[PDB]
């Protein structure tokens, strides 16, 4: 398993459309999750899984 | 530092109340995440500070 910030994903690793696709999410929740800087964390598995969360302080 | 589930820093580490006081929030904003069983991670440090995150599934 790979953890990974969305930013550097996206930059360094996979497109929009593809994660997109491997999350089952509309690509402009993507866009939106750059766009507002989203701590949005990607985790990768090795049997092929893509996983998302948004980390969120509390208090925030 | 260590990270560990809400539920688990409340049965070995402390409780609701000191918790609370500790990040910063109500007593109540705590009782709120136990009674919605909301995923929350508590941060313990090595000097004794905790933080607080939740972590939201996408979608």
């Given at each position: 398993m790979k953890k990974i910030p969305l930013s550097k994903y996206l930059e360094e690793h996979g497109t929009q459309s593809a994660l997109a696709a491997a999350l089952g999410v509309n690509?402009?929740?993507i866009?939106?999750?750059v766009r507002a800087g989203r701590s949005i964390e990607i985790t990768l598995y090795e049997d092929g899984r893509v996983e998302a969360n948004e980390?969120?302080?509390i208090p925030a």
């Open positions: 690509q402009s929740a866009s939106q999750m980390i969120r302080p």
